[PDB]
Ligand binder design. Sequence first.
Ligand SMILES: *Cc1c(COP(=O)(O)O)cnc(C)c1O
Ligand SMILES: *Cc1c(COP(=O)(O)O)cnc(C)c1O
Lengths: 396, 396
Amino acid sequence: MFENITAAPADPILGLADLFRADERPGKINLGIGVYKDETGKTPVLTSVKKAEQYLLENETTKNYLGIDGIPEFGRCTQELLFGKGSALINDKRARTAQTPGGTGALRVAADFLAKNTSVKRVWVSNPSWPNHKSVFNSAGLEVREYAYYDAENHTLDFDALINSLNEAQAGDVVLFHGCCHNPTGIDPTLEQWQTLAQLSVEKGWLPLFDFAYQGFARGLEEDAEGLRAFAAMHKELIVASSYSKNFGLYNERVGACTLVAADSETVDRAFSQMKAAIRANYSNPPAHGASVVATILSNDALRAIWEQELTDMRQRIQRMRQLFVNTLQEKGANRDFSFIIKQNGMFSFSGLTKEQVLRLREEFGVYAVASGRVNVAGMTPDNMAPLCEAIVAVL
Amino acid sequence: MFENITAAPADPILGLADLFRADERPGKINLGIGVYKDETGKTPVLTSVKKAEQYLLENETTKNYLGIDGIPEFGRCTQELLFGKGSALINDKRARTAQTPGGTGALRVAADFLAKNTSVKRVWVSNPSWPNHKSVFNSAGLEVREYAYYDAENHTLDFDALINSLNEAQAGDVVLFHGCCHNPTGIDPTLEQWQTLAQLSVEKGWLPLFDFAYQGFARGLEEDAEGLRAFAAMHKELIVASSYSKNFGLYNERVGACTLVAADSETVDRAFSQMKAAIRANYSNPPAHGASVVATILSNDALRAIWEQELTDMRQRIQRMRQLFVNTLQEKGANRDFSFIIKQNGMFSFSGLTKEQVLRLREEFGVYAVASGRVNVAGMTPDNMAPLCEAIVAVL
Ligand SMILES: *Cc1c(COP(=O)(O)O)cnc(C)c1O
Ligand SMILES: *Cc1c(COP(=O)(O)O)cnc(C)c1O
């Protein structure tokens, strides 16, 4: 039965973590996966997290199954993070959140849900976009077309091209947006551009799906949600797949949520009962640990002040590696001008490095960037900044 | 978009948990859902687990993404649980194991893998069988037919009726078997009967798919897998969705594994690469906490000895409750003979109660059992044994 199965191509992102491993070059540099590293090159467990964990070890008395939808406080606390405190969607009881294994898991459950309870045929994901969007949507059976986004010549948001390409979008289609910190570009629409986009999906009839995976990493917890919010204000229906992987440094615990907002309480309640049926058909119920942690941290005023501090240190440290990179790049000989990198938000900059330049960096210099030229700035430290900028310049 | 979504029926097992967590009657008895309960009426966190957990808190330095397939030693410790330390599938590098969100997460990825990389079109699940088998397979795209199993008259395995029913399955079809502790009948094949099904399966070209969710609740760790080991010796290929939910009391942490065996390593390698592709499109990578706990325990001689003692305590308390149940039943003057209940194994008993007795039993006596007459003998306590046998005896 398995004899003619062909081998699957390694993940463009997750595949790098593999090569880097089997690579023995002593001074190798990993700028691939979107995991935060500190000044010393480690991905530390946040303090607020270790504290929450102590608390759980002491106070947990059962492992008993959570419910299809997970921990209630988790959902409740994530909607205030998403929508705001004393928000219309929350008072009206328009929304329902299921806890899922990471934001990928949210994406998929949203996919299987739509494919199965709606007349949804296709989803629009930006160009470029996180490579895995394509794969989860096709797995549920949805077609994914693409809308223009990045202007590679001026390294900006091509608003027109975005708008004009979206016109081929039918009423009833899903249009996927990135809450903030566009992966891979890091170029986000402004608030006015968000509102403009909020008003069009309402007139054109699309159902927005937000991939919120970097809340906190651009400007601030609240600021980062303006776009999603400008939208929730005008939309009757919405889907939000958010992740706690990056902002809680909780990567392998798998914490995310799929938030379903409808016109009203009874509808959303009804819509949501099918989502739970899909989750039951998939992984049954979610992993308790990471979600309990996030819940513990968000529901305790002290733990939460600490966490907010830690997140703010991650954000800011990344903003220092951005400005250090262009400098060292211009200090070291850079032919081109990489200053547009400073205008990008999040762990990533789209370098504008050619697939042969990235292949060379990896091969000749052990420097690992992704084939598109997306480099993880948070993977850069003041001790590897010099060897990095010399590898890149010797390949331009 | 959501206005037309029909509300979904509650899960026949998981929804029960809610109807229960909702009637404010005082002496209400939940006998529906497979969580273990001790003499005091709760599902405590096992002590080997609290210990492994402390170790993790002290010892973890990072929450960085695991690999799509999870933790190596986890996979490696699972295979020896399944096949046997020594075992040819291990030394010939014939199996590959992926860490998954529970046995339900295993079953689903095997379904998604089978449906997209093979020509499998239908799968055979016994009658009766875990109600969720059908929803999982159907979600992947597969059709599920049924093979005879339970003889409701004599409360046994209707061997020839199962064998005659399976003779309608074609070469290239998936036939799902339960490793031990048939859910919900508790009737399991004999080793002789396992061989016969092993040989016949090999002759009819079926692909065996084992759901092993109770290793250790029947006779013991090693002896519960005999049936499974009987097929592995004769087959080139087979898959195993195994759970650690019940036997490690890690129910909400979601720990299980999908084990893929092929004729040889080059093949299983190639096969597995697509199984990793199906996972990446689903949840991305597995939750670390509980598989790190299981790994720690199986790796450590002290922790493993303690955990094994805990398992044999649960198993034995259950075998105590099943003898106490048919006796007190026999003492409160139950019209019927319920002696077969002793004959079955694992957490459950197929009571033989009609849909209406079990509905009466709950509205009227707060005794919660699954509509099929399935009762969790492990939710029985010497305190609640008297009131429950009087509820049962009064509806028959
Ligand atoms: C990281 C990320 C995801 C995946 O989050 P996980 O929780 O790791 O599964 C999805 N979308 C975007 C835009 C991301 O950055
Ligand atoms: C419990 C069970 C499963 C599920 O294992 P989980 O880890 O809880 O998903 C699968 N099959 C059977 C027969 C079970 O009893």
